[PDB]
From Swiss-Prot, chain A:
Gene3D superfamilies: 1.10.8.60, P-loop containing nucleotide triphosphate hydrolases, Winged helix-like DNA-binding domain superfamily/Winged helix DNA-binding domain. Residues 158-228 are annotated as: Small ATPAse domain (RuvB-S). One of its GO terms (cellular component) is Holliday junction resolvase complex. This is Holliday junction branch migration complex subunit RuvB. The activity of RuvB is enhanced by E.coli RuvA. Residues 1-157 are annotated as: Large ATPase domain (RuvB-L). The gene is ruvB. GO terms for biological process: DNA recombination; DNA repair.
């Protein structure tokens, strides 16, 4: 289901060694671990890493959310926590300005004011560990980032790690995916575990409809082609974006007002859930005057070069 | 208009001696006078006495009302913003103070510190300058023991003799521009129920009647006939009181009647009736509060000209 020991955690090298060193040192000196901050793209397994750390330290977990916190933070900190446990907060950059200022005394000297004529009681808190997860250090204020003892980064997964995660999922579900098929599914994923799991579930549905018990590489490739994925993992939406840019604008510089309107999209999700992968794959460039196709989308889309 | 010196105050003997002694002693030792509480029936000149005391002390006033300083934040605002050292804070109807408002009055009166009304909000303990608080209420039973214990001086306002009401009427006529005679003013005061407000109201009504009749000097006969036109008897009874006695005697034979049949027989309520009607009747020996009801005391039969039982 979900890994518990740090050895069961899939991938994430150059971080498990450092995390293990810190955890064993904290256990040896018999003190709670310092507050930890986890960066990286969403859905790489930050909550799972928090659970693994909590299970390795032999303490409880109090997972909560950023936009779910006023005195409710104090209510969570007061009774729901023992000494040395974790208070993993997801999307810590979305904390309210009022609620953020209450965290600094909590993390600094472990005393904070509780609500209630009078509303100022400096209730002392037990020593605890706070883990925060946010997608980018630029979204967090300097005073909050300064109060975290350990800051780490989660990198993307190699296709083999995603393949073995797909293997674990299939073993748990009761499927007999093959090595080549799972590796192809992982390769067509965008280095994200959630995307790999979603793709595996869709391939499982397609194979079940087709009437098969063992999924081979050819069947997985056919199902993924039916989904609408290319060899670079591009969906239909990204291909549509590149096609409309190249056709309607000749590939020339286009600002992030004409491109979104031409696609019936918004300047929101587009350029934050579509363009990052295109730039990472060398498919789109952010010219100061607009955007270009980098001469590679012409080869990918089979169009004559400019 | 309004008297300022304690000598100009009309009547109220056996109280001006003690009040003068206290005022002069406080002036001699150069300290604010202790908190004062005066009882008495309403409209005998309590606010006027407060004004006289304040003027004789040579300080200001902050006259307010009982049911107007609830939510004690405004009480703190009044005590801090609009007061100096030694200023009276006369509160009318002090018994109608809210429990929350009253609880904040005790520290202000005892040690002159109060908690004025956000993480902290109502936490500041403002130091309060020495001041005098004067309270006004009708009956000592309406005030709670903790509040009554905080007052250094407690006195009582008694009713006015007819001569005092008469000279008050003369002063009112002089201020207005009328030439009432001494006998007419004495009759008006005699038909008043020992209170100054009623005497002034009667004088204004008699002035209107005389003006309508087309006169310039009001004589005793004119005042008597105008008061008869008003509906006042020799004992000062209004039409309502005579109606009460008449309905009791006729419809109930003068026998004991509770304060549920009597109010309903008069379309009144058990409220103002027995509060603004029966006090005078009992005081004049016209009605008695029997345990089983009420009786006419054998004098209402003579007053109303009915055969005795
Ligand atoms: N490295 C991993 N090994 C095993 N399971 C994982 C891993 N990473 C994520 N998961 C699975 O994904 C879930 C975490 O949700 P996810 O969206 O991937 O994290 P995030 O919300 O941080 O992106 C867990 O339930 C877990 O089963
Ligand atoms: N002893 C007095 N001498 C002169 N004027 C008085 C006296 N008593 C009351 N008054 C007049 O009555 C007014 C006070 O109102 P009143 O109803 O008599 O007091 P309370 O509301 O305490 O019964 C003042 O304006 C004042 O002119």
């Amino acid at each position: 289901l979900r890994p518990k020991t740090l050895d069961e955690y899939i991938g994430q090298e150059r971080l498990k060694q450092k995390l293990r060193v810190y955890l064993e040192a904290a256990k040896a000196r018999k003190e709670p671990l310092e507050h930890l901050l986890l960066f990286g793209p969403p859905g790489l397994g930050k909550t799972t890493l928090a659970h693994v750390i909590a299970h390795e330290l032999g303490v409880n977990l109090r997972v909560t959310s950023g936009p779910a916190i006023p005195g409710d933070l104090a209510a969570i900190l007061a009774n729901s926590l023992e000494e040395g446990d974790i208070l993993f907060i997801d999307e810590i950059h979305r904390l309210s300005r009022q609620a953020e200022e209450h965290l600094y005394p909590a993390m600094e000297d472990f005393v904070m004011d509780i609500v209630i004529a009078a509303r100022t009681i400096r209730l002392e808190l037990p020593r605890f560990t706070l883990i925060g997860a946010t997608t980018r250090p630029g979204l967090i204020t300097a005073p909050l980032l300064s109060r975290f003892g350990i800051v780490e980064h989660l990198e993307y997964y190699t296709p083999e790690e995603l393949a073995q995660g797909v293997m674990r999922d299939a073993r748990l579900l009761g499927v007999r995916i093959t090595e080549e098929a799972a590796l192809e599914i992982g390769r067509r994923s965008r280095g994200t575990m959630r995307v790999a799991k979603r793709l595996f579930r869709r391939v499982r549905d397609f194979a079940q409809v087709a009437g098969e018990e063992v999924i081979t590489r050819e069947r997985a490739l056919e199902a993924l082609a039916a989904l609408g994925l290319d060899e670079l993992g591009l969906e239909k939406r990204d291909r549509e974006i590149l096609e409309v840019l190249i056709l309607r604008f000749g590939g020339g510089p286009v600002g992030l007002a004409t491109l979104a309107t031409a696609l019936s999209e918004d300047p929101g999700t587009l350029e934050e859930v579509h363009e990052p992968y295109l730039i990472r794959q060398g498919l789109l460039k952010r010219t100061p005057r607009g955007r270009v196709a980098t001469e590679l989308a012409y080869r990918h889309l089979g169009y004559p070069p400019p």
